[PDB]
Amino acid sequence: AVKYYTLEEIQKHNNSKSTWLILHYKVYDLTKFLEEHVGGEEVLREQAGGDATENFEDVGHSTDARELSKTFIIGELHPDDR
Template structure:
């Protein structure tokens, strides 16, 4: 079983002030610290997404199949998608998501299939 990380844990590893640079891509967590100097687009491209979800940027960059294979070398775990959602009651007693929490939506069929990707 893969190591599970909370989004807040990944956010702390943003590559700044001597910290490692972790990225989230397709629900997986990657430590790309050692790859910063080797990235063809430059380390700054990775640091821009340090501690964040870089899935959309990764897809838009048009990475080769070799790049996708190489990414596996940097995987350190996955995002804990089973974490409970925190809610706060409103003044009228109804619950709503807290301002500091991430609301979860139902995944599309494509997103579900991507979660089972081997990378």
């Protein structure tokens, strides 16, 4: 099964308690990853609650980072908001 979230819902997850963001229409819960990110937590907090696909691709993440990112996926963006 697949869980779909709307932009309205995702936008609410941008506080000290929860950090979500969108990458290629998939929703990632990075709340517990913030402090482990070698690229820092500041760059993640700034994108919280929205689509960070361009910024993610602009820095050119390695294959290992992309494979790891999959562990944080909690769903996808609702088709109606795409």
